[PDB]
Amino acid sequence: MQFKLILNGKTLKGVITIEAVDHAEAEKFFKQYANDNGVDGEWTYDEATHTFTVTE
Ligand code: NA
Ligand SMILES: [Zn+2]
Q1: Which residues constitute the domain of residue 27?
Q2: What does each C-alpha distance from 24 to 20, 29, 43, 45 come to in angstroms?
Q3: Which ligand has the minimum distance to the alpha carbon of residue 47?
Q4: Separation of 11 CA from ligand 2 center, angstroms?
Q5: How many A from CA of 10 to the centre of ligand 1?
Q6: Ligand nearest to the CA of 25
Q7: What is the DSSP letter of 43?
Q8: Torsion 39-18-45-55 (CA) sign
Q9: How many structural domains comprise the chain?
Q10: Domain of residue 26, CATH code
Q11: For residue 34, with 0-12 CB atoms within 10 Å meaning exposed, 13-18 middle and 19 or more buried, which class applies?
């Protein structure tokens, strides 16, 4: 399945899309991406479009 993260950072904007075998793995990956990049924001998830957003 495809999933998307929209990053609405203070000085970094982004869109990333992944291929993930299940919903848990996509969640886990975007968790780890958050820890790895020091992302501190408010999160949403839209199941209809498989879209996470994070807004710093
Ligand atoms: Na930023
Ligand atoms: Zn789904």
Answers
A1: 1-56
A2: 9, 9, 16, 13
A3: 2
A4: 30
A5: 4
A6: 2
A7: E
A8: positive
A9: 1
A10: 3.10.20.10
A11: middle
